Write a protein that binds this ligand. Structure first.
Ligand SMILES: Cc1cc2nc3c(=O)[nH]c(=O)nc-3n(C[C@H](O)[C@H](O)[C@H](O)COP(=O)(O)OP(=O)(O)OC[C@H]3O[C@@H](n4cnc5c(N)ncnc54)[C@H](O)[C@@H]3O)c2cc1C
Ligand SMILES: Nc1nc2c(c(=O)[nH]1)N[C@H]1C(S)=C(S)[C@@H](COP(=O)(O)O)O[C@H]1N2
Ligand SMILES: O=c1nc2[nH][nH]cc-2c(=O)[nH]1
Ligand code: FES
Ligand code: FES
Ligand code: MOW
Ligand SMILES: [Ca+2]
Lengths: 1286, 99, 50, 50
């Protein structure tokens, strides 16, 4: 084997035993100790592993820089390549690079796990273009995801490269002259002739072919050899498809495979050329050649706009996409329709054939022989009378898999409208790229007219049929898209042949990005406030700089002990079955295997869970796919994974209950009905003028914290002692659950939480599933052990938001006033209780939202099903109930034929009113937030403008909606509303603060440092918070319910007071002395400089039995107005503008609070419009990664994004007059959902019917499928009983 | 702990003060983030002084538990502790002594 | 002295804000903490001695 | 202390001490030490940040 030689951050690396299966990410983290680059999904869709790659391009005689996903980059493809990671551009120990400084100061970093990846995407852009345009800046992040920020701050901060939250004038200018140089040694190597290289791994042999001749010989000798260039397909097959290719040949270096030639028929690209190269060349061609010759080029470019992201496009090759022959390839349909020419070769042979329907004979196959390889591709110039179109529709515009994608071409007789050739090729409608030949053949010699449009649509409907059991589902939607795309092509061609109706024009326009506009309004601090008093100022997150530099340590970043082992969970593949037997004979053969652990290995109890209704390891029966049966422990993560995969479990299925409907039918619930009833319903419905009944459903949601669950367990070997480092919001329950499983006193277990790369409720309890399993492994082996879940494991096992089904009935007057409401809620709880009950209680607590309902009855039922147990998710049941509320409220407005905002306002509570659970609303600020939002958003003026747009547009519509919200503050569980703190002042005057809360990106420690600084009247620079641990503050409630600031703030405040009282005597005896002088004097006088602080939220304790008692300490309020534009033909939509007015009392930190508002808002936006989890009928989750589960992307946020914090509204119920902000804003994302529904109504009035008071159902999330299907028209209709009673 | 049995004696003291078996008490280690500005373990006074500090902290615990003991005299130490927790009474405290 | 266990220290650098966690065979965690902080030139609250 | 497991990247330190009771340090040469396998670095006064 040859040595692999490359560079990392300017340092030369010589790997004498390179394994072909080793990814750059693993190498960086486990071999080089550079933990700044993170693992977020392992499938190329999150960008957390982004790094920059630099190399000398022989064909261009130039040094090129591009980004790439370290998780998919085989180190074996990097010979003589220079890698640059986040650590390579700067750090807080030396100096931050401008990119790092700005994302940090602009508040573009919360939890910080995505920051390095985003920092590197931005850095790479600047290395290519020192002064990019706003467009280029946004496009740089098509492949980076952030769950915390809401993206706005990241884009706005970086836009500087093209009171206030941050000041751009303080930013150090970018100076390219000071960038690290290309490693000189590499520049010398460029003068050495390339040579074939051979790498040998544990299971794979890799050959780097230097010449075309070597490649062809290799293929003649090893026809099975798998070629690899970008590895964006092979990597996936290896990692997730259980594939193993013994021999790989990388032809990336071959000149012929990288050549670009401009011929008379078109432009040729070597099969190894990266899509980014093709994109660059075609763009240049489109800018230089006549429009009539670039029809096909522009089709290719349109698809490339929505093809993965920069990281993938910079490494993905042409040949790779063509030969992979995926059913959903976005390029093959274009290549087929345009007859793009393919030059195929093998040792001794060569042929060129235009791609046509026969090239893809069957699933994942092409017409290439086993010995052949694709040498080059020639994309044709378009001829006169020849037009082309390419379309793609998915679940999200950016980096998503096509639902339906196509390439369409038409060739007319010279100067006519008479069809000579017609090709309509689609992806996503069969197990391969297909051409609608039957349909198009019938149009040859026909003219481009209405009749042809009708004939083709009918033809498509019949030819591209989908059986009800078609993989991927969405049968109606996909068939509708096939016709809608043709309609768009049809109109577009009429336009090019040119008269077209004005209201039809927009249907032919390609997606157009609008310029961003963001404004944040907040209140300045008092005129005389001290500069050292930071409470109320926009102080950046204290760890933001270290998060941008990759120095911030997350659980897995902690170094492993020399003897530390790895654990991989073995989970059930059945929803409900008896475990007949377990065979590990195969797993025992995997190298590095240590042991298989199961229920019988537990020394203490196998009973766990919040309600003791769960097992640590399944015993006798499995009750859900993902149910933890046991675990494998091995010397490396790969070995543990591989061994666990071969553990064979024999099952015997049992009747299973999956859905809410199944549960209701089988009477499968947890506990009895929950209910809140006030007033006289019967009487209420009797006086109502109108009554509306209906059903509504809201799908679940995966937390998708960028950092998955992780635990490290260190067994001491003494008295049962164990120290664990865990990514959790609940150190207390982690500690007691581990102790219970081990059968030892709680005082023997230490749990430490530095920070979480996101939690969102998903780490309030479910983190124990991993922690307890890891603790058992550490106990049994005596070795430290760790486990970080891969994204697919996390999404399958750990649970998510509760899906809700609602049945409602509302009574109201013609005026819109509500007089009666009955709502029965049903949540799918999964295979255990966990937090499901409290979540339902919060739901019932918010079924009113901001409306006074005199007669009301709400019930809740927890459905017991064979699905992973669902848990807490930002909102804790509130969002679901608030959504149901707004749904019927919207139906009341329509039924009454009155403006929605008028109906909402007249039903709104008034200062002093009692809620349905009889708590008085004091300091009810919704009215103010409402009027100010209506005003700053120019609601009314824009409302008329929306109607105009809808009259001038037939296939596009806009919607506008303004909704309010109120969220009750305090844990539904009374005793959880307690908090403690511990503070030490060392003899140098420096202060170490410790409290029960944890940092998950919300900026809790920052706020606590701000609080302590103010209370002690010393600069924040003298105060520090290192971590959260069970041995500094015991029995802490999980960091949750958005009250951490409220309660830990008081505890920290109380502890500071005690310190001040103790120092008072010394301050008096030396008034002119310093803080340091007083501290030292106290110490030498033997006065303790250590104390605890505690807080208990007063007067809490509601009872669902008596409908009395205070459930909450106060309420947080807000209002949001959103406008959208929907494409009635595809389901896609734009979030044009959103205006939010939030009441957070006197903010402790407006930068962090606006960040919480924007972030929560985007997660709600995701819950209601983009995020959807699909399950097989048997209960097996289909969507287990960012490729299929689409959370909001950079391009998903409102183009015009305005946020204002209500001024002059101090809250006397909390620390320094502030208010909880964590969860309250999330529901406001629903404003986007209802603006969408408003738009759908416009579309239905346009093509569906004329019933202006029709109430069509729209469940959540309002995805492109639901939006398109709701826009009933001639197309949806195209996609017969013997008798019918009269 | 350097072999003189300091932690043993402190566990013995805490057990007597709280009036519970030593088996329910544990001492894992000494750290600057739990007890700051500590004098070095020396002068043979560790038992004397830390014994008092532990004693005081224990007294603070008993006082906080007293209301619960009074309401349920026949209950167990575990019963009172849990009751205290659910009534949101802090079960953490410092202790200090000065000769 | 001839303590059977000789002097010994393990020092763990966090890489964040000068933080360092040390496991030491000493009767004086306080002075160990301040002396290490003094040498490094960082506040005492950044140093943990166990 | 030393029974605590070493991290996979944990290094070892050996003190370099004076062999004279009282003298000026004219120079320090580590050219020979740098040849020993596993050598990482020699630390002296100037390396102290604080
Ligand atoms: C996050 C993510 C997003 C993606 N988004 C999209 C998308 O939007 N649309 C889409 O269509 N695809 C998408 N892809 C798929 C993938 O990136 C493409 O199929 C890519 O172009 C394949 O190129 P590669 O060089 O990485 O392939 P590799 O994985 O290196 O190779 C792929 C296959 O091609 C064969 N092969 C390669 N070169 C040759 C040759 N010259 N001759 C013969 N056989 C050859 C190999 O043997 C192997 O079977 C995505 C992938 C990821 C991970
Ligand atoms: N960046 C970030 N923000 C976040 C979260 C998170 O995990 N990451 N959790 C949310 C949830 S579910 C809650 S209950 C609150 C918890 O923290 P707090 O009480 O300090 O506001 O923060 C919210 N904001
Ligand atoms: O009332 C609650 N609200 C919560 N939000 N996140 C976690 C919560 C909890 O446990 N209880
Ligand atoms: S870890 Fe590489 S793209 Fe998510
Ligand atoms: S700050 Fe981006 S995912 Fe947390
Ligand atoms: O932990 Mo908040 S849902
Ligand atoms: Ca549950």
């Amino acid at each position: 084997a040859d040595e692999l030689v490359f560079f990392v951050n300017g340092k030369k690396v010589v790997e004498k035993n390179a394994d072909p299966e080793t990814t750059l990410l693993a190498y960086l983290r486990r071999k080089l100790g550079l933990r700044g680059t993170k693992l977020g999904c392992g499938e190329g869709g999150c960008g957390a592993c982004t790094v920059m790659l630099s190399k000398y391009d022989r064909l261009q005689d130039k040094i090129i820089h591009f980004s790439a996903n370290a998780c998919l980059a085989p180190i074996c493809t990097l010979h003589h390549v220079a890698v640059t990671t986040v650590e390579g551009i700067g750090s807080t120990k030396t100096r931050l690079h401008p990119v790092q400084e700005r994302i940090a100061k602009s508040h573009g970093s919360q939890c910080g796990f995505c920051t390095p990846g985003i920092v590197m995407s931005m850095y790479t852009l600047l290395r290519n273009q020192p002064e990019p345009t706003v467009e280029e800046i946004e496009d740089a992040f098509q492949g980076n995801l952030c769950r915390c920020t809401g993206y706005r701050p990241i884009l706005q901060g970086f836009r500087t490269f093209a009171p206030s939250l941050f000041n751009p004038e303080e930013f150090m200018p970018l100076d390219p002259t000071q960038e690290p140089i290309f490693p000189p040694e590499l520049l010398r190597l460029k003068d050495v002739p390339p040579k074939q290289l051979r790498f040998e791994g544990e299971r794979v042999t890799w050959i780097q072919a230097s010449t075309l001749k070597e490649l062809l010989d290799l293929k003649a000798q090893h026809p099975e050899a798998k070629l690899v260039v970008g590895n964006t397909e092979i990597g996936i097959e290896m990692k997730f498809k259980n594939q193993l290719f013994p021999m790989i040949i990388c032809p990336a270096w071959i000149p012929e495979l990288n050549a670009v030639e401009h011929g008379p028929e078109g432009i040729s690209f070597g099969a190894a050329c990266a899509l980014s190269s093709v994109e660059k060349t075609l763009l240049e061609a489109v800018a230089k050649l006549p429009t009539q010759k670039t029809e096909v080029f522009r089709g290719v470019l349109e698809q490339l706009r929505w093809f993965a992201g920069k990281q993938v496009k910079s490494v993905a090759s042409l040949g790779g996409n063509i030969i992979t022959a995926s059913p959903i390839s976005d390029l093959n349909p274009v290549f087929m329709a345009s007859g793009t020419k393919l030059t195929i070769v093998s040792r001794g042979t060569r042929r060129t054939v235009p791609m046509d329907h026969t090239f893809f004979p069957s699933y994942r196959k092409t017409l290439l022989g086993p010995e052949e390889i694709l040498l080059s591709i020639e994309i044709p110039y378009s001829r006169e009378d020849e037009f082309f179109s390419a379309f793609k529709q998915a679940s999200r515009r950016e980096d998503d898999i096509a639902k339906v994608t196509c390439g369409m071409r038409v060739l007319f007789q010279p100067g006519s409208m008479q069809v000579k050739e017609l090709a309509l090729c689609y992806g996503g409608m069969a197990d391969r790229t297909i051409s609608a030949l039957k349909t198009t053949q019938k149009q040859l010699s026909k003219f481009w007219n209405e009749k042809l449009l009708q004939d083709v649509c009918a033809g498509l409907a019949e030819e591209l049929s989908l059986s009800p059991d078609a993989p991927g589902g969405m049968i109606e939607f996909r068939r509708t898209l096939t016709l809608s795309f043709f309609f768009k092509f049809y109109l577009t061609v009429l336009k090019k042949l040119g008269k077209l109706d004005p209201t039809y024009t927009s249907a032919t326009l390609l997606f157009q990005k609008h310029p961003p506009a963001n404004i944040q309004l907040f209140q300045e601090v008092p005129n005389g406030q001290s500069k050292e008093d930071t409470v109320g100022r926009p102080l950046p997150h204290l760890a933001a700089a270290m998060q941008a530099s990759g120095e911030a340590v997350y659980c897995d970043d902690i170094p492993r002990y020399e003897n530390e082992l790895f654990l991989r969970l073995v989970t059930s593949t059945r929803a409900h079955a008896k475990i007949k037997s377990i065979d590990v004979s195969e797993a025992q053969k995997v190298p590095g295997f240590v042991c298989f652990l199961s229920a019988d290995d537990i020394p203490g109890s196998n009973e766990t869970g919040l309600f003791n209704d769960e097992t640590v390891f399944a015993k006798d029966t499995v009750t859900c796919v993902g149910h933890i049966i046991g675990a494998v422990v091995a010397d490396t993560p790969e070995h543990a994974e591989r061994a666990a995969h071969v553990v064979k479990v024999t099952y015997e299925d049992l009747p299973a209950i999956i859905t809410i409907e199944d549960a209701i039918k089988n009477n499968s619930f947890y506990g009895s009905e929950l209910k809140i009833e006030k007033g006289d319903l019967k009487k209420g419905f009797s006086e109502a003028d109108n009554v509306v009944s209906g059903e509504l459903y809201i799908g679940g949601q995966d937390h998708f914290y960028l950092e998955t669950h992780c635990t490290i367990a260190i067994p001491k070997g003494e008295e049962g002692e164990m120290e664990l480092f865990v990514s959790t919001q609940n150190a207390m329950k982690t500690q007691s659950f581990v102790a219970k499983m081990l059968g030892v006193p709680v005082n023997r277990i230490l749990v430490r939480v530095k920070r979480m790369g996101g939690g969102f409720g998903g780490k309030e309890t479910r983190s124990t599933l991993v922690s307890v399993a890891v603790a058992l492994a550490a106990y049994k082996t005596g070795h430290p052990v760790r486990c970080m879940l891969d994204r697919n494991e996390d999404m399958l096992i750990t649970g998510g938001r509760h899906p809700f089904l609602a049945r409602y009935k509302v009574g109201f007057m013609k005026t819109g006033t509500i007089v009666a409401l009955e709502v029965d809620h049903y949540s799918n709880a999964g295979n255990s209780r966990d937090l499901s009950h409290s979540i339902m209680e919060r739901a019932l607590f918010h079924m009113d939202n901001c409306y006074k309902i005199p007669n009301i009855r709400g019930t809740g039922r927890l459905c017991k099903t064979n699905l992973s147990s669902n848990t807490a998710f930002r909102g804790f049941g509130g969002p679901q109930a608030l959504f149901i509320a707004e749904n019927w409220m919207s139906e009341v407005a329509v039924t009454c034929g009155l403006p929605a905002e008028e109906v909402r306002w007249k039903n709104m509570y008034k200062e002093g009113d009692l809620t349905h659970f009889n708590q008085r609303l004091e300091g009810f600020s919704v009215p103010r937030c409402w009027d100010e939002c209506l005003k700053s958003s120019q609601y009314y003026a824009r409302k008329s403008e929306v109607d105009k747009f809808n009259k001038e547009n037939c296939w596009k519509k806009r919607g506008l909606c303004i909704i309010p919200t109120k969220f009750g503050i305090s844990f539904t569980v009374p005793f959880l509303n307690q908090a403690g703190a511990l503070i030490h002042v060392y003899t140098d005057g420096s202060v170490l603060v410790s409290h029960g809360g944890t940092e998950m990106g919300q900026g809790l420690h920052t706020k606590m440092v701000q609080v302590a600084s103010k209370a002690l009247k010393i600069p924040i620079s003298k105060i520090y918070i290192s971590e959260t641990s069970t041995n500094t503050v015991p029995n802490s409630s999980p960091t949750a319910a958005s009250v951490s600031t409220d309660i830990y703030g008081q505890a920290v405040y109380e502890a500071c007071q005690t310190i001040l009282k103790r120092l008072e005597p010394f301050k008096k005896k030396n008034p002119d002395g310093s803080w340091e002088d007083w501290v030292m004097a106290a110490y030498q006088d033997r006065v303790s400089l250590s104390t605890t602080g505690f807080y208990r939220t007063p007067n809490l304790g509601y009872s669902f039995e008596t409908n009395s008692g205070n459930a909450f300490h106060y309420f947080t309020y807000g209002v949001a107005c959103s406008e959208v534009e929907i494409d009635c033909l595809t389901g896609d939509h734009k979030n044009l503008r959103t205006d939010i007015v939030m009441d957070v009392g006197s903010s402790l930190n407006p930068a962090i609070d606006i960040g919480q508002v924007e972030g929560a808002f985007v997660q709600g936006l995701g819950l209601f419009t983009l995020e959807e989890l699909h399950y097989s009928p048997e209960g097996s989750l289909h969507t287990r990664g960012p490729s299929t589960y689409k959370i909001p992307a950079f391009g998903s946020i409102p183009t015009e994004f305005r946020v204002s914090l209500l001024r002059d509204c101090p809250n006397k119920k909390a620390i320094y007059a502030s208010k909880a902000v964590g969860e309250p804003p999330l529901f406001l994302g629903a404003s986007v959902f209802f603006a969408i529904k408003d738009a759908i109504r416009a579309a239905r009035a346009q093509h569906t019917n004329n019933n202006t008071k029709e109430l069509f159902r729209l469940d959540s999330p309002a995805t492109p499928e639901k939006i398109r299907n709701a826009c009933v028209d001639k197309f949806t209709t195209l996609c017969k009983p013997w008798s019918l009673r009269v």
